[PDB]
Amino acid sequence: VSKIIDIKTSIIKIPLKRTFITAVRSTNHIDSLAVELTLDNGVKGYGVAPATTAITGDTLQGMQYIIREIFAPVILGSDLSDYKQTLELAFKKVMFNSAAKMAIDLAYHDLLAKEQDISVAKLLGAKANSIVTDVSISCGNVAETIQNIQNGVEANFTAIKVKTGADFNRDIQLLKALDNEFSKNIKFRFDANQGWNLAQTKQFIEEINKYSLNVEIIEQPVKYYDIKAMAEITKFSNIPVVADESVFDAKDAERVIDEQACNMINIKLAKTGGILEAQKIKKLADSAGISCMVGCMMESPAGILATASFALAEDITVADLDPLDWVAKDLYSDYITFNEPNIILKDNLKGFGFNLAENLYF
Amino acid sequence: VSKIIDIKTSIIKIPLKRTFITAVRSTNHIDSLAVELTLDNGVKGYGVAPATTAITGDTLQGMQYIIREIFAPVILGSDLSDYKQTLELAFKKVMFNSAAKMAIDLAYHDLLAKEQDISVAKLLGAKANSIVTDVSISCGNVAETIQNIQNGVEANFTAIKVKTGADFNRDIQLLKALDNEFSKNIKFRFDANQGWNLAQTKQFIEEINKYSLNVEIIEQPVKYYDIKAMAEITKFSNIPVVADESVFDAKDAERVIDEQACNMINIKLAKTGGILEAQKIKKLADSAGISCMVGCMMESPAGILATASFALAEDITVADLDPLDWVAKDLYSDYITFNEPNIILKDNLKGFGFNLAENLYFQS
Ligand SMILES: [Mg+2]
């Protein structure tokens, strides 16, 4: 019986090819915390999670403390086979900090897979190796946005995630410009990230229907907590409505299902606190006839790999996984081939297929 | 026109006189972060918040980074009178971490009051200087529990918060012992810290009604997110039901009001992220005809003083403010007179009156 006898953490910063700007921040790098779990048979397993403070409230410094001083005492000396119980015991000691939980859950899955000499994708039941991602377009003036999208199409992406919600007038005018520069072979996914009110959302949808556009989803149009507005928009809309920030965990999923507040849930491991909780959401959604997609934070290729592994195992084909496009290929080329827009897992990896050698050891 | 020109912090660790055990956890100490804001006229203002990771998710290390690296750039160089906009812009950059926000909000209030040469309680509009607190009692076996309550009664406490929810069979058996040992001049408040399920909560309330006990409240019997069960319990119970972990902020308050999920809200500054958000909750609760009490984490006397100042200004008279009873008197005696069970603000203090720089070394 294998027991976890050591836990290490390491901060990893990855430079971005271009400046990444959000509603609250501008940055040139990804902040991640990595965790290493060591079994008493020598096998090591790894998980890596982002510190996206504005979204999940995680900080590198908080995650490090939580894992070292709170999770570690519960985990150390425990049997690997008891992982579900161990994780439940550990996570109940910490409210929020879902990214810290993600790191730990991933490292456990890496161990489980390595103990069976298979990939995590295989452990989770995946057979297919490949998933299509959209390309993500930051907010901007109409002109530069049209150009960004054109660059995306020229790069072979046919699904375009267009961020909205910063400037409603801009969002409205964009639709005319889209209808004029693009055909139905381009699929649009809008994410307002909470930036619209109820009336604005309805209007934006109405505006869409005035044109000829292929629009797959409207994502998180209103505040994460306004579930009534989400339900009303879902009912009103002829386009699938996606809950993202409205759903972190399984109990959030239960609420949006009960209140009929979306057609589809955007699962992100950094919100769920890893694979176990993400599986619970997918199960609830399946039973409710609610679809799931996967998404991510601006995060390391390791996080992308874990997310793709989960999605392949769960028959989730809709993915917003673009951060691979923001970093140097040699970071992920050992486990992933990105032939846009296809994210393809490499053959025969044990566990996830990445190691921390450069960061931990060299 | 005063500008904030520096922001510094210090960790505070306080030992407890006895072990604090709830359904959620057990501890012998308080970890807090203090923050100091310095105005360009040399006036300094202070806030202190607990790191209760199992409840708010805050950690000293996370709070430290958020305050110094995230909030600070927004705050530094800004005019004190711009505090509302500045806090709104800063807090938008951080999901959760409500205790970090509490520390900053309190420091701002300390400055606002000091600049007017008054106390924070005066600034907020308080008339009264005194509020009565219960004393709270750790989970434990019946005999130990009875002894702890007896200690509290001998200390002049007549309102007794009994922690439950760790062991349901123990909780049921305890009711018999309370009925045997105490009169109706002792008022009980039960707090399960989410530890019971729906069936158990109904059974406990039924059990209470088999005895002769003065029972004032049943607090957070079930999981913070099971609002349906909270509503069912609220509708079932003849005893007021208090939402604690179910309500952090104003939008949480809106939900439990809308769903009739409690009769009373337990406001804590460590959940609200400070006084500004707590004021918003009180206002919503008043409009809904819902009562409020104030509460705290097991936290430093500075947070108690801040919370008492708020309660006094808001006409909130029900309080679970006991941490003063768990720590050395000399930690608070500069700013508070605790004549048990009365928390009394001292006269003529400017701002809160914490006096933190005397005992702590602040660093940017
Ligand atoms: Mg989104």
Side-chain angles (χ1 to χ4, degrees), chain A residues 24 53-57 59 61-62 65-66 70 93-97 224-225 228 248 251 255 258-259, chain B residues 53-57 59 61-62 65-66 70 92-97 224-225 228 248 251 255 258-259:
Chain A
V24 305
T53 309
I55 303 289
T56 72
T59 55
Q61 299 79 6
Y65 170 84
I66 286 161
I70 302 176
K93 294 186 187 308
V94 172
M95 183 70 24
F96 310 127
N97 302 274
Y224 74 89
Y225 53 85
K228 287 181 183 165
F248 279 48
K251 70 85 168 61
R255 185 186 186 188
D258 181 51
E259 306 196 25
Chain B
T53 310
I55 299 178
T56 71
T59 55
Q61 296 77 5
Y65 177 83
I66 286 159
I70 303 182
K92 265 165 205 184
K93 300 187 179 311
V94 176
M95 184 64 46
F96 314 128
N97 302 274
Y224 69 89
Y225 53 85
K228 290 176 182 176
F248 274 50
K251 66 84 172 71
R255 183 184 182 191
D258 180 68
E259 303 196 33

Side-chain angles (χ1 to χ4, degrees), chain B residues 43-240:
Chain B
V43 176
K44 298 163 195 302
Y46 296 91
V48 181
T52 309
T53 310
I55 299 178
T56 71
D58 284 270
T59 55
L60 297 174
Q61 296 77 5
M63 290 160 86
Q64 168 52 62
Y65 177 83
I66 286 159
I67 287 165
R68 299 205 304 212
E69 313 305 330
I70 303 182
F71 293 165
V74 176
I75 290 168
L76 287 167
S78 74
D79 285 349
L80 175 61
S81 50
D82 286 343
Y83 72 101
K84 292 193 179 194
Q85 308 98 294
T86 301
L87 291 179
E88 182 182 347
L89 282 154
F91 289 2
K92 265 165 205 184
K93 300 187 179 311
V94 176
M95 184 64 46
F96 314 128
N97 302 274
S98 54
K101 298 173 179 166
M102 166 183 182
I104 285 284
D105 171 294
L106 267 49
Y108 259 98
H109 282 89
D110 197 27
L111 289 179
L112 293 166
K114 283 168 175 171
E115 286 287 271
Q116 290 184 41
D117 195 42
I118 55 182
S119 73
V120 172
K122 185 74 164 186
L123 176 75
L124 298 182
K127 293 308 174 185
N129 72 341
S130 179
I131 185 162
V132 175
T133 180
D134 59 37
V135 62
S136 72
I137 309 291
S138 290
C139 290
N141 71 43
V142 170
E144 301 177 309
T145 301
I146 293 305
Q147 185 61 66
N148 282 317
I149 301 175
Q150 285 170 335
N151 293 342
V153 176
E154 293 293 345
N156 215 34
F157 296 99
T158 64
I160 303 299
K161 170 177 272 203
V162 172
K163 291 297 185 169
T164 53
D167 183 346
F168 175 76
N169 297 137
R170 170 275 198 177
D171 297 335
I172 292 295
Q173 297 156 184
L174 174 61
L175 291 170
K176 184 167 86 159
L178 298 177
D179 178 76
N180 225 248
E181 304 284 351
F182 305 100
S183 81
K184 62 207 174 189
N185 283 321
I186 302 301
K187 310 153 51 186
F188 293 101
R189 305 173 178 173
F190 296 103
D191 184 357
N193 282 99
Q194 306 175 67
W196 296 326
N197 65 33
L198 176 62
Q200 284 171 335
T201 303
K202 293 185 220 178
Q203 295 184 35
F204 187 82
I205 290 160
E206 289 175 329
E207 198 81 357
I208 281 166
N209 287 288
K210 304 183 187 177
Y211 293 102
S212 332
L213 291 167
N214 185 341
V215 183
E216 188 181 4
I217 63 179
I218 303 297
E219 175 173 348
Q220 201 66 48
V222 298
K223 288 297 199 322
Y224 69 89
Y225 53 85
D226 194 342
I227 296 311
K228 290 176 182 176
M230 286 290 289
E232 177 163 353
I233 290 152
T234 292
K235 187 180 175 190
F236 174 81
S237 183
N238 60 315
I239 303 169

